[PDB]
Structure formats: C-alpha cells, structure tokens
Amino acid sequence: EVTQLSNGIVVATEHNPSAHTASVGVVFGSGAANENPYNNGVSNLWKNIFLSKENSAVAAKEGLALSSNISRDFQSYIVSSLPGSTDKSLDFLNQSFIQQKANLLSSSNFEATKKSVLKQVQDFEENDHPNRVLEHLHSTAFQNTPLSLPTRGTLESLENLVVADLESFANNHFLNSNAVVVGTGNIKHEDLVNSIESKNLSLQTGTKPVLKKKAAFLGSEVRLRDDTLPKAWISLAVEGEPVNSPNYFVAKLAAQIFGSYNAFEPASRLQGIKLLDNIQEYQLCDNFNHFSLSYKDSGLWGFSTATRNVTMIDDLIHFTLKQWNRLTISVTDTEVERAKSLLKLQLGQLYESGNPVNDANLLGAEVLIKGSKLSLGEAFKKIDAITVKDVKAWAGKRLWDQDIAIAGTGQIEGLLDYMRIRSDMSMMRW
C-alpha cells in the first residue's frame, strides 16, 4: 500500500515486508529544465558532489549506499541500507546534504569534481552515439525552451561554473515546497513519520522561481554526419502525451504494439510484430525500439534505430512509417489483445522489481505531480478497458500528418531530406 501524509514535508511510503533492504530519499521537483544555457550542467555537478569520494566514504563507513539521479523534471538523492538502520540514513541525509554545504564546496573538491565531470561529458559526446542522438533529438525538438537542455551539461558551459553558481542554485531550488521525502522497502510509514518528527528536517522557506516560457515542440532536424564511424544511428519522434493526460496508457500501448527488435537474437525474429515481415528479407537494420516518454509539459512518441546497411536507410524509414500509418485506419483486435498483456508484463516488471531504488525514484517522481500514487490493480483495468476505437482516436490525433523531429549521426548520407520523410506520415491512398 502507498501512504502519503502532507504533515511537514510531503512524506510518501510504500511498504514491502518481503524485502531485505530499505531506501530513504529526497526527490526535488527541479531538474535540467530549471537551468539555463549559461549554468547548464549545475545539476550534474551537484550530483557528482554528493557522489564525491569523501562524502561517499563517510557514508559507506556507516554501511550506507548513495544514489543520485538527474532528469528533466526531478532530482533524486537516495540513501539505501539494511532494514534495521533506516534511521541512520535520515541522519546522514540531514548532516551532509541539507544542513551544511561548505565542506562539499571547498576549492580542491570543486576543482577535482569539475575535472572529472568534464572528462565524463567529453567521453560521452564522442563515444556514445545512440544516447547522444536522443539528447540531440530532445535539444532540437524543444529548442529555445527549458526542456531541451541536456541533463549532463555542455562542455563549453561546464567550464564557466564556479561555486557561486552551485550555491545560488541550491538557494533557489532546494526548498520545502519543492521536496518529497520517500520511503521504500522494509519500513513502516508510521515509523518514518515519527523519525522525521523527532528531528527538525526543515529544508528552506519556499517560493522557487517560476519559468516564464512553457515547453513547446518545433518540427526540425539536426544532422551530425561523421564518415569515420561504421554505422548510422537515427532517432525519430513526434509530440506525445504529458504526465496526467487521459491518453497516457493508450500512448504506452500504441508504443508496445511495435515493440523492439534485435536481429541477432533468434527468438525476437518470430515475434507477432508484422513490421519484421518487411525488414527481415534484406537485413535493413540491426536493432530498433519504440518509446513513449512523458514529461510535465509535453512528451515524445517515436522510435530509435541502428543499422550497417548504409545504402538502404530510406527503405527502413519508409516501412516503419507505413506501419505507423496502419494504426489510424486498420488496426486489428488481435494486435490490441496481444498489446494489453505485453504491456501488463512490461509495466509489471517495472513497478515490481526487487531493487527498491527504482521504486523510490518512481514514487517520488509520481507524488510530485499527481499528488497520489496509482495502484497496480487500477492500472490494469484502464489497460484492459482500451479498445480499437480508442487507439484509432488517439492515432488520428497524435501522428497522422504531424510534424516530426529527427536526429542522426554516422554515415547518414543515405538519410534523405526532411520533407521526403515528412510526407510519409500519410498514405494518400485513403
């Protein structure tokens, strides 16, 4: 059961007696979308300061494990431990992250962390193609709007930061009205609330800055061509649904219909996905996957693919977009029936895995928007209630003759112009 109390800070807890671990954490409603192009990467630097050697050493001496996660809409700082020592994690979180920040922002520590983060971002930008392609897709989809800033930070901006930027961001965003205290695993809600009440655990006053511009989607493309690479990596997307939309689960199911494909695994060549019937003959791709990502203001629905067949890219894109076209007009009931159970198993593993850190992140990110956490059972009935008419109604609105965003790198010379791709979003025979 999920129990949430608004006394003090918003305290959420999900109790699981079977687990042998307990996680206690703080989730902030600010993310990479709350920063600007001149201090971009301040959140990643804060994360790596919390994860620095001295802080991690003092934590691990007591027997605790530290996790930090940076995203568009939230920042997560989690302390995981054994069930008997769940009170010690609160003490470490109070003493280190909240009460005092002078020790963590010393000159030498800041310089070392800055040099390590610069090295990491430099390695990412050159030797991680499928993920940086998705980052550029975000950066070109939401350009000149908060949601397009990369979460790690750019190489040029990360140099200009000083400790003053970090402390300014901490003053502006680490607030009581922006925070949720989350408890996961083998702990009780009453015990957690009592433990918080015994201490003060006050973060700050409130009134975080309000953004003047809301995120917007622009049809656009960016091409980063490099002929010294062996493949071509391509990510393509349209505007999707945000969190708290009525069509959220319909979006995830429509994504699940096409699924993912790996050419080298024997089993995934026999899937009921009809798209493979066009792909398999000439080995058009090595792998693809479909995504329905949702944020607070907007979302992305699309796919990502990698291939060595540098002379047949347009055929791959054409067949994929013709499979997308089929959703509006001629989706069949068996497709939806398979999609329901595939999605239920897909959602089942996500929310019911052994690791409590994923549960903590999900619960903290959920209560910061909805105000409450949807149960597993009520999720299934909405999934089971989906019909063919709903899928057709959603697809006729979100992907029929709509603008797209594209991002590719590698031997993308075979990738045709924008308009030729944009015309594939309709059939013209219907």
């Binding site: 550029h136 950066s139 350009q143 750019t154 190489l155 040029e156 901006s157 917007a216 980063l224």
Partner: protein
C-alpha cells in the same frame, strides 16, 4: 560553440504555430493548384 546551442531562425519562424490552421493554409494553396490544373488538363 556547443553543437547543442542552435542558430537563430527567429526572422523565418511564425509567431503562433497551430497545426490545424497551418496545414489548412498549405493544403488550400496545393488544392487551388490542383483544382485549376484538373480544369486545364480536362
């Protein structure tokens, strides 16, 4: 300059991008060319 920073396209861009209004104006111009063309071909 970082690749993530994108060049200024402001003088080219429309103030309000509404898909239903935008695709209707383009389709009407294409439709007009088709309507006169069908008449000429006949």
């Amino acid at each position: 300059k970082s690749t993530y920073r994108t060049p200024n396209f402001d003088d080219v861009l429309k103030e309000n991008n509404d898909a239903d209004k935008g695709r209707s104006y383009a389709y009407f111009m294409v439709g007009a060319m088709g309507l006169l063309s069908s008449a000429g071909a006949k």
